Structure formats: C-alpha cells, structure tokens
Design a protein around this ligand. Sequence first.
Ligand SMILES: N[C@@H](CCC(=O)O)C(=O)O
Ligand SMILES: N[C@@H](CCC(=O)O)C(=O)O
Ligand SMILES: [Li+]
Ligand SMILES: [Li+]
Lengths: 260, 260
Amino acid sequence: NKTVVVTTILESPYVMMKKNHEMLEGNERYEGYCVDLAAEIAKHCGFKYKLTIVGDGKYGARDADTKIWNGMVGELVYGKADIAIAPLTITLVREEVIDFSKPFMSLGISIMIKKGTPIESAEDLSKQTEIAYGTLDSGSTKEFFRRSKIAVFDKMWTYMRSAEPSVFVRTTAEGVARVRKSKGKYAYLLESTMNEYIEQRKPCDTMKVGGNLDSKGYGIATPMGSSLGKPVNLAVLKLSEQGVLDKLKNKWWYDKGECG
Amino acid sequence: NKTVVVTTILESPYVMMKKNHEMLEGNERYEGYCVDLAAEIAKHCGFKYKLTIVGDGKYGARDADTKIWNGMVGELVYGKADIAIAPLTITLVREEVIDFSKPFMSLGISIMIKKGTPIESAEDLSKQTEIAYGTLDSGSTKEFFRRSKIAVFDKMWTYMRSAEPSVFVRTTAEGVARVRKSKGKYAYLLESTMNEYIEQRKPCDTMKVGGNLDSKGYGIATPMGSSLGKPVNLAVLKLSEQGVLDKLKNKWWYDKGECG
Ligand SMILES: N[C@@H](CCC(=O)O)C(=O)O
Ligand SMILES: N[C@@H](CCC(=O)O)C(=O)O
Ligand SMILES: [Li+]
Ligand SMILES: [Li+]
C-alpha cells in the first residue's frame, strides 16, 4: 500500500552519507547499519519505505515546560513518521508514548578519553576537576545522569549541569572533536556502541575506559498502537535469531576498522 | 483483586530453596534473583501473588507432532499461570504465542568446561571428537543449534542430535555435574548468566571459555493479550533505570561468590 516514512538520524555507522551522495537520490544517498536493517525489516514485512533524516538532528526529549517532544520521538508522536529505525534507546518515558520492538542491539553508557588521560572510571571523573566531561543533548545519556540516585552519578550530574562553558554537545561528532582537541582535558560520556566504533577510526586517538555504567537496548519505534509494531518486532527477533544482526554489527564496526 | 499465579523454575540463583524451607510456607520457602524481582514487580504493579514451581521443570518447547507447549510457556498458553518470572529467553517462536516485557537481563550462549580442558571456542569443539558436548532439553539453547544455518553451529548440532549416549540434560544442575565428573571429556553449552554464576561456586572447577555465541535477553512473560503485560513492562523498565536490576545481579552472583 502506502510508502512507509522512516525517521532516522545521521549518526555513524548507523546512517552515513555515501561517497557519491551528490549524484544519488532517495534511499540510495545513505549507507550504514540502520540503512541495511531498514532494508531487512522492509523485506520481511513487505513494505516500501522512504528514509528521512530527522529535521532537528535529535533523538528525542520532552520539554519540561511545554511537554512537547522533539527529535525522532516527536516525529512519531506527532504523526510525521511511521517508524524510527535508528540507535534509539528504549527508556521508560519513551515507552509510555511510543511502541518499541524488542532490542536489536545491547549497550550501556561508557567513557571515551583521549589516549593517555589519567581516568579509568566514572568514580575517577567524579573525584577531580581538571578534566571536564559531558554528554549529548536531548538523549538518554543526559537523562540517565539527571535522574540517577546513585551517589557517584548524582555527583557527576551536579557538576555537569552547572559547568561553564557547557559540557554538553549537540551531536556525537562534536563530542568526539572535543575529546580529540582538548589535550586530555575533556572526556565524553556516550553509548558503548558509538564509543567502540570511534575507537576503530583514524586517527586512533581515543579509547573506551571502565565498565559500562548501565545495560539497555535500542529498539525500532512506532507510534503507539500502530499496526506496524507487531510484524516489525517479529522481524527483529527473526533477524536476531538468524545471525543477521551480528553480521551487520561486524560489517559496520570491525570488518573495515582502521586501527589494527 | 485476585491473587496472581506466578510460574517459575528452580534454577539457581534465580529461585532456590531457602535453608529452612521445611518450616516455611508459601512464597517464604524460596529465595533468589527472581524471587526478589517478583516482589519488586508486585510492589510496583500493586498485586498479591503466589510463586509456583513449574510442574514439569521445563522452560518451554512445542512438540512438533502434537503442537502442545510444555514448561512455563505451556502454563501461560493453557491458562494455568498468570505470569512467568524466570530466566525465560525471549525467542521468536515464543513471542508468537505469549507476551514478553522488554528484557530484564542480557545474555548469550556460552561454553562451560572443566578447568584445564583444551577447548577455547565453539570452533574447537566442532573440530574434535574426544570431548562430548550438549545442552539443556526443552529450552532456547537446544533450539539455537537445531535452527542455525551457520556452518560451525550446524556441525555441532549434527553431532549432538545423534550422539550416544545422549548429550542432552534435563536440568542445568545435571549439566554441571556432567562437566565436573567427566575428567574433561564433557563440555556444556549454556547461557552466560548461568555459567558465570556456577564459576563463582565451590568447588571452583569450571570456567567459561570463548565469546558468547549470540546476544539476547530474558523477559517477564504473560499470556497473550493479558492486561498485566503493560504495567509489568513499565515496571521492568523502571527497575532497570533505577539500578535495581544491577543491584540484584550483584547480590545473587558476586556479593557472596565463593571462588575469590
Ligand atoms: N541512543 C541515545 C542517544 C545517544 C546518547 O544519549 O548517548 C538516545 O536514544 O537518546
Ligand atoms: N533460558 C532458556 C533455558 C536455558 C537454556 O536453554 O540454556 C530458555 O528460556 O529456554
Ligand atoms: Li511504548
Ligand atoms: Li508475544
């Protein structure tokens, strides 16, 4: 029937511009883990689709004042897209307003440092002031710190929320640049999936340190009650069980890694 | 209103008999990760409940001939329990017949050996015949091997399905005993969660080797369409985000580990 509108986000290696994108149109402009996953889910569910990059470049948060959702979550809530296929964390507040598949990838929050930075853990970050640290805006990592009752994470949030200049970034790439350019004086808190990808990219100057701070998952999201949710969830489980999700992770993370 | 009937399974450290169980009655007979999780979910959802150990001691599989489900899955499908709170793997075939929460624990299939056994991987097992290996009956690990199209896992299944004497066991404890007693000539394929627990128990003679073979999760299950599913799923996500699931994992795996 109708073309399914897929909201997604330009986040490497999930969705990236193809080298020759300026000559290409439509879905062919893009490549990556989520582009491949969208093709697999569409094939299993039997729909045609159009990939659309979220206008505001955000994952999704609800404004405390207006109660309005932004980002990909907002695109689903307000009826501007039919499905989100992206590294979108399954969270309580989001689950209350959109539907999610079972997870297609497991992850947790992690620490990225410039190589040689003397930090091995969140506790280490929390006990010093020389090295600044922050998170992405409008996403689940920022919310993790804002809501935590665990002393070390509350201490980190109390620092981050009032730090000057701001420690928060608008995109993962801006966080990576800040780590790379800050001579060891900025560390970035981000999901293990993104951190592990970046560690395999030139110039090979970052690394993931410490254990993950939490354990959670990304899911494919649909507007609440959409008939697409049920077949999409069954497709995710099938792809998981057939080993396809594992093959795609290796393809986009490790197969052409650049750091040895 | 009505007392919720919870089906569960005696699998350490998820549900275990308390030391003084012979003097105790009802839910007080039991302790463990799933006993604590049931209490937390009941508190958040506001129900009273009765823990019941599944009669046949199985997780759940569908008989190819009769199409009848056994185990905890069968208890839900046939209306004998209201909810399953257990280390029950979220799988495609189960998702088609019962509802599941988002996962409360992440895991994958793994290899348990007696210390000193010269095996480091599934590929190693598959390329030799001196060391026998098998899985639990009536569960998701056996089904993983039976359905895999990946050459190494298909080769392992072709061996396991015809091995004599049988390499399959009825309970995890029987698998552990077979590893411990077989002088290095049996290796057991089981979920990483169970393997990591057993590695911390006396006599400290087993170990987990190699990476996990897959990535998946346990969920709380309800009969399809039950009104309990929605609040239970929101409770799982809340407990996840508050760090309670992490606290319970540490409590039952590591806090009183016996092997250093
Ligand atoms: N996956 C996150 C974005 C990344 C982050 O917050 O670190 C989300 O869905 O909000
Ligand atoms: N968690 C598995 C049981 C253990 C196994 O198969 O290794 C299930 O739900 O079937
Ligand atoms: Li939801
Ligand atoms: Li289901």
